[PDB]
């Protein structure tokens, strides 16, 4: 994963989510897509 | 101070092969330096038969001549082949007006005009840095004259010694950034841990056709032209081999006589691939009389960069011009540090290159003639899956005979995973 200040997405299964204040987002294509703290 | 000196200007050129003992650059290869530099060539001033001087490198009179030649023909710069110590440039400047540059700063200038990858950027500007750090040292004089000559209260350490430390800090800084880099490409090299790691590397002068052979062997896009620095940046692409299938390739930059010291020191990152490389493929030109020398040129740097212990494979490329021979195997011995008969732009010589190679890297050719009864779809499977059946011949009642030749690690991953009661492979 990363903390890329820009987030976007990396598959079609990717989906933005809120958790806590933090803007998480995940896929399942590969986990590595896990953007967050954008 | 990452600053660049321009290439592409009018120049009084001065050169002297005519020194008598070290010799070097008939001129023409230096002219090529000039050429790919894009220098606005003007005239070729040349001196005579001298040992090098504490003076103005060359002789007094000729020096005066080049000075005047500048002042009249209006050269933008006194290019001056063959290296000098900074004061030499200094006294030379007193007799001129313009920037002077030795062979070195030329080569750096062109080098930097060629930089495109960020890696190349750092190692370049590094070489630029280390080089210029020396030359700056006399230049205090003006700066001193304006300074007043006494009144250094506060500092004990003298100025410019200060500046010396500055550039030291630059240096360490640069390499510092270089660190994570070599680590990077090294992380790429962790893949070189997999046991199945053929790893060739090519070598020669620039215009050793390196780009070309690499082209045809790879079916890949690597441009090639008369100019020096016809390649920059290492370049990976995989290739076939009869006995390890996969086979990583990475082109190196082409060489010259007397390539700069600190260049290499910055350049160890780029060549860090060469070191590990399991085999030094070495193309050589076939048109130049320069032949021997170039080998002697190449050997030079090979020495300083280790791994000249590596087995090598010469390719007398550029057989086209010569019609040297039909392309052939050329066992120097059973050992094969072989000469190979090529003209890369035609590249007609390849199959012998690969075949000879096929001899040169292995360690298990006990082949087996495998067989099964209707239970072989899985065999054909594995064989296409990994490397090769040598031969597929089906036969009665689904009993089917085959021949296969693999390196042993295969033999045991196979003997393990499969029941291998088929037991022709061990």
């Amino acid at each position: 994963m990363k903390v890329r200040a820009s987030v976007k997405k990396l598959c079609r299964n990717c989906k933005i989510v809120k958790r806590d204040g933090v803007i998480r987002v995940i896929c399942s294509a590969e986990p590595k897509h896990k953007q967050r703290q954008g | 101070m990452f600053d660049r000196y321009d290439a592409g200007e009018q120049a009084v050129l001065v050169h002297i092969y005519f020194t008598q003992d070290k010799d070097m650059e008939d001129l023409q290869e230096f002219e090529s330096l000039v050429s790919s530099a894009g220098v606005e060539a003007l005239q070729v001033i040349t001196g005579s038969r001298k040992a090098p001087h504490p003076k103005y490198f060359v002789g007094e009179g000729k020096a005066v001549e080049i000075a005047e030649a500048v002042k009249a023909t209006g050269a933008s710069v006194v290019l001056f082949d063959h290296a000098l110590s900074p004061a030499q440039e200094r006294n030379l400047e007193r007799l001129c007006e313009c920037r002077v540059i030795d062979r070195t700063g030329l080569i750096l200038d062109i080098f930097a005009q060629r930089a495109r990858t960020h890696e190349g950027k750092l190692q370049v500007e590094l070489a630029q840095l280390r080089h210029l750090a020396t030359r700056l040292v006399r230049g205090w004089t003006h700066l001193e004259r304006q300074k007043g000559g006494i009144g250094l209260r506060g500092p004990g350490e003298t100025q410019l010694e200060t500046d010396r430390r500055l550039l030291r800090n630059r240096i360490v800084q640069i390499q510092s950034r270089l660190e994570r880099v070599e680590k990077q490409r090294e992380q790429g090299r962790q893949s070189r841990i997999k046991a199945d790691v053929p790893t060739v590397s090519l070598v020669g002068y620039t215009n050793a056709g390196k780009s070309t052979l690499f082209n045809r062997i790879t079916e890949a896009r690597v441009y090639a032209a008369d100019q020096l620095f016809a390649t920059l940046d290492p370049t990976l692409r995989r290739i076939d081999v009869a006995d390890v299938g996969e086979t990583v390739l990475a082109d190196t930059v082409g060489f010259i006589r007397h390539l700069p010291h600190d260049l290499v020191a910055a350049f160890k990152a780029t060549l860090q691939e060469t070191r590990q490389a399991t085999l030094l493929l070495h193309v050589i030109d076939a048109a130049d009389v320069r032949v021997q020398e170039n080998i002697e040129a190449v050997n030079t740097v090979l020495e300083e960069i280790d791994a000249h212990e590596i087995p090598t494979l010469l390719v007398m490329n550029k057989i086209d011009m010569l019609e040297d021979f039909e392309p052939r195997i050329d066992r120097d011995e059973e050992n094969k540090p072989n000469r190979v008969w090529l003209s890369a732009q035609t590249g007609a010589g390849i199959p012998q290159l690969f075949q000879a190679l096929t001899e040169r890297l292995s360690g298990e050719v006990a082949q087996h003639t495998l067989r099964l009864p209707p239970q072989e779809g899985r065999l054909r499977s594995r064989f296409y899956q990994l490397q090769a059946i040598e031969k597929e011949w089906m036969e009665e009642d689904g009993s089917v005979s085959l021949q296969v030749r693999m390196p042993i690690v295969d033999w045991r991953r196979l003997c393990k995973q499969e029941p291998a009661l088929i037991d022709y492979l061990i």
Partner: protein, 176 residues
């Protein structure tokens, strides 16, 4: 919103019992109240389980629909149980039951044991498998994975407890 206003309907065997915000839920074997209700004025009638936001809350149908989903889960709980097939696989591994403690074997020197909080029990059709059975739909699966937690199965051969069937990542890079 959707289900949030969908009535729950109380099954005849089951006995719902409103008491303040919470609702005791005696049943076929379950009998509790996971629910607690900050806002929504959920209420019994014939079987009628009222919802819809009460005052002002914004959490309105959120919390409410949540409440339905809960009790509706809950009553189904007081009917019966839930999470199962909490499998483990790979060589040398095994598991067992006793009392409420559960054996597990994962290459560790110390034997793997944890004891269930009640409302759920288990069984061993094989050491390979632990079947679970709990009155209330949350805690059972939660703790089930919490049982998995000791060893999230390893990608390169799937060793490690695997919660339910659950196809997982399966890469084969940097091997031999």
């Amino acid at each position: 919103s959707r289900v949030a206003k969908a009535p729950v309907v109380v099954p005849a065997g089951v006995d719902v019992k409103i008491n303040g915000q919470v609702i005791t839920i005696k049943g076929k074997n379950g009998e509790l109240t996971r629910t607690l209700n900050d806002a929504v004025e959920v209420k019994h009638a014939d079987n009628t389980l009222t919802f819809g936001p009460r005052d002002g809350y914004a959490d309105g149908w959120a919390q409410a629909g949540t409440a339905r989903a809960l009790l509706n889960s809950m009553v189904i709980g007081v009917t019966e149980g839930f999470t199962k097939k909490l499998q483990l696989v790979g060589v040398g591994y095994r598991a067992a039951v006793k009392g409420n403690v559960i054996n597990l074997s994962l290459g560790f020197s110390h034997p793997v044991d944890h004891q269930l909080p009640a409302g759920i029990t288990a069984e061993c059709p094989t050491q390979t498998e632990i079947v679970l059975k709990g009155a209330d739909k949350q805690v059972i699966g939660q703790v089930a994975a919490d049982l998995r937690a000791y060893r999230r199965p390893e990608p390169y051969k799937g060793k490690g407890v695997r919660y339910a069937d659950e196809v997982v990542r399966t890469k084969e890079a940097k091997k031999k």
